[PDB]
């Protein structure tokens, strides 16, 4: 093909869109509703407008290149068209960037600045209560910011295949929301927050828990524990212009100490706990020749997916609590026993890359003796905002260590944030358990990677079993519907709601499509975790010294007794 773009001649054999071809050839074309190789088919934003000679104005994001095309991307007709569209968007947009949580990384603002657009008449609502929905424990909607770009709808469609995020006709006007405009919690929504990640503006956010945390920190009698997820240490640096794939663990510890937190632990410890209980459970399931298959239960998005679509699998879920909830359970029991603290005065806070964790933490039965396992859950973005509000120079902070009692962890718990991590860790412990040995080769690279459905054959006590790793909720739906589950007899299956694992969680830092093109965010974030794994002395969860001490002195043997009594949680079908 011979393509003419801005007077420059190209000769290509590629069959792609004008947008992609221009992007690959250093030619600037703006875009808004185009994301995940999809645009808003019904009401296209037309920000990607270009002028094709002989045809007129077209949308470059969904228009294929053709030989003989003379394309103008910067003609004044194009520019005033785009500016017109952006102006129309401003007409329905509360343009107050000051107290906005997307102030420092908003695509729409950058478009407005770029094309110097102004609203015909400024959108300034007196009563935002009609536009705001905070009923959910995980998600919040602010339709004063919504551009109706449909990126959340699409993202929900491709990531989960639930379409829990829909276009709705709210008595006259088009909005986005859950079915029947109900609270997302009351629908088949997984609360995975991929819709948030896809949103270019502040229309979609996480349900804030920062006030819980602040009030806890300022409360004189409250002893505040904080523990961050595996993924957090490999992600938050992005929000401080430190780049991608930067390990900032120690900096996070220091910052958390400077935020006034009373105890600094780590969720990876709880991951090691989860591996203790669940590998014990898998070994005893193997010895009893059932029940098979056993699914992981550490992902609340997947748990909700089972509750809403496959309730018959609820009893197939591991009884072991998620790292978060099991850590929280241990923090209200074991920790006071080794600290002398009043359990009622303990306030446990987790830092998560996930929004569904908020819902999981606020489950009614996720407590004992009136004491919540987890009292508050803040996202990576929330912790970043908290650090910035305290004016803490994160990038320049020196490394510190976590409090050892419940802060030590192995590489097995370290790789949890990546797809296949839980599987690999669980195998590392189960193989050692069932064979009564301490094996040398512990790397299971077959369950790693970004393949949607991963399958492996493992040999435990010289008998072979089939394991599977489901990477994404849509892939769970594919795995079940296509009958792949019934092809062979699977024994242990990992399921994560977010593709790539927790490192691509709904509470993770937003990434400009600019870097989505240049950086493989999932692999780059996971690489930090695996790098931590290969550089750790202990790479098995049952070699965690602090954890071993905890079990020996307090819980006893995992999988049974008080361990099974309080560190486990089972879900019931209706
Ligand atoms: N609880 C828990 Fe997990 C652990 O450890 C996180 O904390 Fe994950 C991460 N990162 C999240 O959110 S949940 C699903 N299992 C894999 S990793
Ligand atoms: S969503 Fe973006 S453009 Fe709108 S107020 Fe917030 S920062 Fe400004
Ligand atoms: S909530 Fe965000 S992603 Fe969804 S339509 Fe509105 S602006 Fe677009
Ligand atoms: S939280 Fe997940 S399942 Fe729910 S609407 Fe958003 S993307 Fe869809
Ligand atoms: S994969 Fe991780 S971040 Fe995503 S919903 Fe599950 S627990 Fe949350
Ligand atoms: S980006 Fe092409 S129509 Fe929206
Ligand atoms: Mg399209």
Residue numbers in the entry: 2 to 575
Wording from the paper:
[FeFe]-hydrogenases represent one of natures’ most effective classes of redox enzymes catalyzing the reversible reduction of protons to dihydrogen (H2) at turnover frequencies of up to 9000 s-11–3. With their low catalytic over-potential, [FeFe]-hydrogenases represent excellent models for a regenerative and likewise economically feasible H2 production. Their active center (“H-cluster”) can be structured into a standard [4Fe-4S]-cluster ([4Fe]H) and a diiron site ([2Fe]H).
R286CpI is further part of an extensive hydrogen-bonding network, which includes the carboxyl group of E282CpI, histidine residues H565CpI and H569CpI, and surface-bound H2O molecules. We therefore assume that the loss of the guanidine group in R286A destabilizes the network of proton-accepting/donating surface-bound H2O molecules near the entrance to the PT pathway. However, as the essential chain of PT pathway residues is not directly affected, the influence of this exchange on catalytic activity is comparatively weak.
